[PDB]
Design a protein around this nucleic acid. Structure first.
Lengths: 62, 213, 136, 25, 98
RNA sequence: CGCAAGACGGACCAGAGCGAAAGCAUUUGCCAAGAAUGUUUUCAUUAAUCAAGAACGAAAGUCGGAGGUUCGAAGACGAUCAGAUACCGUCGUAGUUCCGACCAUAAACGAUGCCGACCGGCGAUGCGGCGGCGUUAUUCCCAUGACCCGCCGGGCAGCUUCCGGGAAACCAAAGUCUUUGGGUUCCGGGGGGAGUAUGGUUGCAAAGCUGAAACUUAAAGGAAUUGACGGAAGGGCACCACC
RNA sequence: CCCAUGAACGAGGAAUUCCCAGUAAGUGCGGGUCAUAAGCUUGCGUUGAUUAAGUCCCUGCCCUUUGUACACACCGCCCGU
RNA sequence: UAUUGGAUAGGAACAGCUGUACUGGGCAGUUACAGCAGUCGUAUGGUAACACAUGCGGCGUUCCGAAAUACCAUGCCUUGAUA
């Protein structure tokens, strides 16, 4: 099984219960065409990298 | 503890020889061990296979049911069984502010292949029409449906089972209805949408080899 | 496991009956006939929670084991046949259809012609619920 | 009290009376 | 008082219509009363369509849609936020939002 | 892949049609009926509304026969819960279906009697008739079918007006009303006690129709206004809130 | 002020308070009270962080619709054995 | 090159009531605790039997394998005490 990366290309606001999950449009580093939407815990500026432990799950948008 | 997928022999299923594509694909059945024979095992199977899989460059919204009537040793000889229109095109044609006109007939060929043909047809908005609702009155529907029954029984009673499938591969029946029923009320999406073989005569392999030769 | 097929200009086609209801997901794979089957893996064989047999996580594990199993016997393309609960119940495919279909192709499978074959009743029998329905 | 249920209680009262008055016949 | 001129339904010269069931509940609602939708939705909307039409056999395959007509009772259509409470004057508007 | 039996008539299906109302939707045939329309046809007041009386009257329910798959009063259990003989879930009997009798009620609603007269527009819609550029099919042109632009009549309705009315909400009728009178049937008289008691009558039953009084009580009520409130929606905000 | 005595208490259950930068927290010093006098209160400096730049999920607040049999206004009103 | 394998380590749902903390307040459940109901052993009184009293002490419970549990509803009511 792989552990993959993804760079933050655009921020999409803030979700969760208490307003804690940042919804983010991430771009993969295998294909620079393949994008998914991801929920992130913790402070995120636009143009940093995340470690995806499963590269399959795509989150519920709004 | 045993391995079930060792006793599985593959057979290349072949469409009848009135098509452009012959090999449909592979089917597996168990090896002929003891009582249960393989040559009686894969002999009752239907393959719902689209027209894009059978003709050169056709439409993908018409599926043919094909039954295997013979196993010639690593070769199935598939006979014409039925025909169906896909969920997609059938559900795309049915829209509000127009009249849907269905017909059915129970008619046999020159050989004893008793079929059941279903027709559908929808009313057209004219190329300058301003009025929205665009319906047909009951005596206009009854005359269209009467001619739908007439053309279906006409163009199936004349000829045998090859010549009616070759009338369904290009939809020569549905275009006769769309042009014949113009001077009652102009129709736009007219299809023989389902054909359902009811009765079938005693099997002769000599004349299945005509459909596979 | 035994296939005499050359890997030159062939895709050998199975048929994937994906029945995504609102409490489970079936990723059933057959031959072209439908009769002889290869592999079916459900959402409830991947989680130990009756809650999450529905889940979109479990439905992608079902397709990952289906695609692992289908490669060993040697079926490399799929005719998808999507399905809901149907009858006088809901025609909406459940919340783990798009997980079981995403995860199929990305496990090295080839997608053929697709169709939504939910059993639509032309004039059904009386629906379970009663006149005033389900009062939550 | 809902008028249906009030009407249902006056209905059972009158079955009780018709029953208990068919005794004195 | 009388809230709506038509009594929140679309029968004017009948007396009786055929009732139908809801989808989420099975509340047996008259056909002309019910809040009806007809959604024509892609089977795989936009997230998978790249990862499906690139792992398909066929050359430029257009993916088949999912046509379903959904009937709602008034009670649920509000809870599912399909319809809203509207201002007494805004109630009269018949045009749908685009 | 078949097979079997019993219900149901999807999408098309509409602020569309028909019917006295209840109500009525798969194809084809048979049976008898009806509205509107058109008419230089016919009889010549034959009409309108109607105590008593009569026909039809959803669902549930009752009786006898056939049938039973779905659903499902009662019932059994599993959940939930402070208890839950409820809501949720798994089963289920009568019933739900057909035939032949019964009962006669519903928020049986437009909470709005029927027949007739008059009084503003506007765009649609259904049915019949009439007239008129052209497009389209029957090609072999006319009459006809499908569109287009108006007209007339009857009909389900819309939008819109300081007509006018109304306690307002609202209503081209709920108008033409202290400037009160076209004809006529039913029916109300503060809230309860009460559609109760008792007589009579109807029904196999359940119950229906007619139906008081003693006694009690200063309000019950209709429409609109403002505020408060919501286990109502939309938009914001606070470390005396959370993350 | 001195000497002797050397108790519970091993980071505190359910619950719960204050707080986002020289901030919290630690450690002192002034003022008031004061014949005597700071485990208090009000001010001052010193050493100096963690985490957040958010949401309406809890608790509450302000607008707009909406519903109401509430007006000593939901700690309201009210039903039956 | 570690599958295993008892056991004590260690987690859990189970209740006999007041009190405190959940509330603007009340009754319910709910948790943690202490006291004593129950309880076990004990010295005496008493007797042919013996089942209790007295005063003095000890006192959860069953589970036997892990525990990352959504834990919803976090229930209903609200002075005659003066407009």
């Amino acid at each position: 099984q792989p552990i993959k990366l993804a760079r933050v290309t655009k921020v999409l606001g803030r979700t969760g219960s208490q307003g804690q999950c940042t919804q983010v449009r991430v771009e993969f580093m295998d294909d620079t065409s393949r994008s998914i939407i991801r929920n992130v815990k913790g402070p995120v500026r636009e143009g940093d990298v995340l470690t995806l432990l499963e590269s399959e799950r795509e989150a519920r948008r709004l | 503890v045993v391995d079930p997928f060792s006793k599985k022999d593959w057979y290349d299923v072949k469409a009848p020889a009135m098509f452009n594509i012959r090999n449909i694909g592979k089917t597996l059945v168990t090896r002929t061990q003891g009582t249960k024979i393989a040559s009686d095992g894969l002999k009752g199977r239907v393959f719902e296979v689209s027209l894009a899989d059978l003709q050169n460059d056709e439409v993908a919204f018409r599926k043919f049911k094909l039954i295997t009537e013979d196993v010639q040793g690593k070769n199935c000889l598939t006979n014409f069984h039925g025909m169906d229109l896909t969920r997609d095109k059938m559900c795309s044609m049915v829209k509000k502010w127009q009249t849907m006109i269905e017909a059915h007939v129970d008619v046999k060929t020159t050989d004893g292949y008793l079929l059941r043909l279903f027709c559908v047809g929808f009313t057209k908005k004219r190329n300058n029409q301003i009025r929205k609702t665009s319906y047909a009155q009951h005596q206009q529907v009854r005359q269209i449906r009467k001619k739908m029954m007439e053309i279906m029984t006409r163009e199936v009673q004349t000829n045998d089972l090859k010549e009616v499938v070759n009338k369904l591969i290009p939809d020569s029946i549905g275009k006769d209805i769309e042009k014949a029923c113009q001077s009652i009320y102009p129709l736009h999406d007219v299809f023989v949408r389902k054909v359902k073989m009811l009765k079938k005569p005693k099997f002769e392999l000599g004349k299945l080899m005509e459909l596979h030769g | 496991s035994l296939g005499p097929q050359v890997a030159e200009g062939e895709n050998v086609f199975g048929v994937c009956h994906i029945f995504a209801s609102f409490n489970d997901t079936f990723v059933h794979v057959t031959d072209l006939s439908g009769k002889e089957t290869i592999c079916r893996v459900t959402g409830g064989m991947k989680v130990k929670a009756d809650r999450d047999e529905s889940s979109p996580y479990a439905a992608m594990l079902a397709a990952q084991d289906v695609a692992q199993r289908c490669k060993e016997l040697g079926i490399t393309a799929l005719h998808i046949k999507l399905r809901a609960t149907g009858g006088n119940r809901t025609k909406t495919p459940g919340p783990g259809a798009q997980s079981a279909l995403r995860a199929l192709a990305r496990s090295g499978m080839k997608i053929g012609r697709i169709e939504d074959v939910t059993p639509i009743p032309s004039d059904s029998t009386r629906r379970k619920g009663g006149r005033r329905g389900r009062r939550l | 009290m809902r008028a249906k249920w009030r009407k249902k209680r006056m209905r059972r009262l009158k079955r009780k009376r018709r029953k208990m008055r068919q005794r004195s016949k | 008082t009388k809230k709506r001129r038509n009594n929140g339904r679309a029968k004017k010269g009948r007396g009786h219509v055929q009732p139908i069931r809801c989808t989420n509940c099975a509340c047996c609602v008259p056909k002309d009363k019910a809040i009806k939708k007809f959604v024509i939705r892609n089977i795989v909307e936009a997230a998978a369509v790249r990862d499906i039409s690139e792992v398909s056999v066929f050359d430029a395959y257009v993916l088949p849609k999912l046509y379903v007509k959904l009937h709602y009772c008034v009670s649920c259509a509000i809870h599912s936020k399909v319809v809203r409470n509207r201002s007494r004057e805004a109630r009269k508007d018949r045009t749908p939002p685009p």
